[PDB]
Amino acid sequence: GLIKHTEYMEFLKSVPTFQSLPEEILSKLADVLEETHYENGEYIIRQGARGDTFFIISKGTVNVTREDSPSEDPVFLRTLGKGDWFGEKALQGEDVRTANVIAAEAVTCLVIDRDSFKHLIGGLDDVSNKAYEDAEAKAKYEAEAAFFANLKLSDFNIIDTLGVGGFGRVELVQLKSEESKTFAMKILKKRHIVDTRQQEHIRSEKQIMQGAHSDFIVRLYRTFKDSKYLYMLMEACLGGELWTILRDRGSFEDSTTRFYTACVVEAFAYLHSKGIIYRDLKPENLILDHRGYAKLVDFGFAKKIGFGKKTWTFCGTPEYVAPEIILNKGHDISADYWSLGILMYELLTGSPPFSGPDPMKTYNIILRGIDMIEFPKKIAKNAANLIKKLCRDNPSERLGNLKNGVKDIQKHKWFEGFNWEGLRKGTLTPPIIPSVASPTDTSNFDSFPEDNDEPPPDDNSGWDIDF
Numbered sequence: 001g002l003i004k005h006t007e008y009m010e011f012l013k014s015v016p017t018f019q020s021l022p023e024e025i026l027s028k029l030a031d032v033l034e035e036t037h038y039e040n041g042e043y044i045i046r047q048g049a050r051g052d053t054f055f056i057i058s059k060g061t062v063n064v065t066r067e068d069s070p071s072e073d074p075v076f077l078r079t080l081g082k083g084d085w086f087g088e089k090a091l092q093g094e095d096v097r098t099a100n101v102i103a104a105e106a107v108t109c110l111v112i113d114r115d116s117f118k119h120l121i122g123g124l125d126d127v128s129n130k131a132y133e134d135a136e137a138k139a140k141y142e143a144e145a146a147f148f149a150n151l152k153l154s155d156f157n158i159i160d161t162l163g164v165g166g167f168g169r170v171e172l173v174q175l176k177s178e179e180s181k182t183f184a185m186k187i188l189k190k191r192h193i194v195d196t197r198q199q200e201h202i203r204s205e206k207q208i209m210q211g212a213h214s215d216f217i218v219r220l221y222r223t224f225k226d227s228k229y230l231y232m233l234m235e236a237c238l239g240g241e242l243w244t245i246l247r248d249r250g251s252f253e254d255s256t257t258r259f260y261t262a263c264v265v266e267a268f269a270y271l272h273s274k275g276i277i278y279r280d281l282k283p284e285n286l287i288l289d290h291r292g293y294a295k296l297v298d299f300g301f302a303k304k305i306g307f308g309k310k311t312w313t314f315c316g317t318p319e320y321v322a323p324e325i326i327l328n329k330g331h332d333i334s335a336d337y338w339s340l341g342i343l344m345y346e347l348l349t350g351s352p353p354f355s356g357p358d359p360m361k362t363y364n365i366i367l368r369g370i371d372m373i374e375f376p377k378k379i380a381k382n383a384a385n386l387i388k389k390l391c392r393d394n395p396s397e398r399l400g401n402l403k404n405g406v407k408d409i410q411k412h413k414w415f416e417g418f419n420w421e422g423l424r425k426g427t428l429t430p431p432i433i434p435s436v437a438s439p440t441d442t443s444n445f446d447s448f449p450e451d452n453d454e455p456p457p458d459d460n461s462g463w464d465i466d467f
């Protein structure tokens with residue numbers, strides 16, 4: 001019906017999830033959705049029954065209940081109303097109903113069975129599948145956040161240590177209910193953060209790392225907190241630290257360094273797309289997963305900046321600080337292209353190019369520039385040429401900040417023959433293949449002694465409110 005199709009259309013444009021979708025999808029949905037009516041107390045879905053239908057509530061309210069066992073009272077889960085929906089798993093295949101949906105008053109639902117939804121999905125356009133992916137990604141992450149929001153620290157067990165410092169430590173943890181699932185738990189002493197004045201640094205680290213979805217960045221699922229520590233639940237990358245592998249090997253070959261530099265270029269293309277400066281690039285910030293792919297791990301100095309704006313915080317290890325940071329001229333994402341040049345040089349030779357006996361002396365040699373360095377014979381011509389373009393003194397003139405952004409780095413002669421697409425798909429063979437026997441294998445990390453020392457003092461000031 002023309003009227004009914006427009007009423008369905010105007011109703012679908014009022015639902016927060018469906019309104020982003022194109023007109024083709026919303027119109028084709030309106031062409032096949034059908035109305036079903038219920039009354040107060042009537043069961044729409046019964047737990048344990050089989051089903052092949054998804055419901056969108058267009059009028060009234062429903063009570064969602066469930067029983068954990070046959071000899072137990074039903075536990076009330078939630079109440080849903082106009083614009084909400086339920087029964088979606090019946091579209092994806094699984095028929096058994098895991099909860100009752102009972103009408104709280106007179107209800108109308110717009111329904112679409114499994115076969116109709118499948119037939120609608122089966123024949124669609126190429127543009128029609130692109131905004132569908134954005135909405136599927138958005139709801140796939142909100143569902144991930146909800147899975148982790150249910151968990152507590154008491155649901156995990158410590159396996160072994162991955163790293164130790166003044167900050168605290170990084171532990172390989174296993175989820176008690178699923179032994180195939182292991183994570184890297186970074187446990188920070190709140191006292192060390194307060195003594196170093198990193199309250200806002202750790203606060204933006206949580207915001208950046210959780211919102212980031214890149215295969216070249218370590219995921220941060222959630223955080224926890226208690227009176228002494230902050231806990232950051234991350235993706236376990238069991239291939240090992242790039243700094244220990246670099247230490248063990250001395251330096252990396254040209255092709256080896258190229259694959260790791262390419263991993264950082266992808267991570268930076270993603271961060272720079274969101275207006276985020278990384279600022280902490282060095283071999284210690286890279287970790288290999290079980291395949292040998294490299295990912296950025298630490299977002300302590302990272303910062304969300306506005307398009308066309310600069311920042312002025314003097315931060316970082318002196319050898320990796322860009323000249324505009326030393327000179328207090330303000331900096332943006334182009335300080336990461338400088339860092340990329342420093343990383344290439346250290347990975348190819350075992351040492352970064354600029355280093356004095358203290359910070360001030362290191363800053364003095366940086367201000368002298370990359371054209372004042374005698375490049376080792378070890379560094380290939382194309383690699384030396386790319387380093388000099390990445391480490392141009394003026395950030396405006398720096399490669400990656402020119403006409404085509406990061407594409408100017410990707411198109412450089414050093415990367416000729418490099419399969420960027422194969423790297424993004426995960427089919428490019430990495431240069432060092434780590435040996436990982438299981439999710440609990442920590443043999444690619446150094447051994448750490450257990451911490452026998454006293455716990456740090458309690459910190460009950462509410463700067464950690466969001467953790």
Ligand SMILES: Nc1cc(C(=O)O)ccc1CN1CCC[C@H](O[C@H](CO)c2cc(Cl)cc(Cl)c2)[C@@H]1c1ccccc1
Nearest residue numbers: 017021025029054088091092112132135136139140143
């Ligand atoms: N939450 C979540 C978790 C996961 C995961 O766990 O991986 C995956 C997906 C989602 C998002 N998903 C949830 C259910 C409702 C909707 O999806 C159904 C098809 O199931 C649907 C019904 C109609 Cl009538 C019309 C359209 Cl366009 C879609 C929505 C969705 C929203 C937009 C696009 C696709 C799906």
